[PDB]
Amino acid sequence: EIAEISRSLKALAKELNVPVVALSQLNRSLEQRADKRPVNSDLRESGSIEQDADLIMFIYRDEVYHPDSPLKGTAEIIIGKQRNGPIGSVRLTFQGHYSRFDN
């Protein structure tokens, strides 16, 4: 069902020539590990959505797992998959009080 939804949304993106942003939850198994950043395998367990996605971005906040992290107020955007560009990470300022990300 999730795989079909992912395929349909990709078809919708191509049909209307528009970027389609779809939010997804990371698998619960990641919390059992809690030792590294999220990876593509964490999403494969929830409907094989990786195969249809042109771009996969993960949100990681060290302060959530480690309140004494020196990266307080910083959110890491991980590029897990990209068809027309490089993979890597981008650090953004997370302002929870304003529900905003800044450069």
Is 44 annotated for ligand binding?
A: no
Note whether 46 and 56 are within 8 A (CB).
no
Q: How many residues does the chain have?
A: 103
Residue 89 near residue 76, CB atoms below 8 Å? yes
Q: Are 61 and 76 in contact (CB under 8 A)?
A: yes
Strand 100-102 versus strand 55-60 pairing type? unpaired
* Binding-site residue set: 61
* Binding-site residue set for ADP: 61
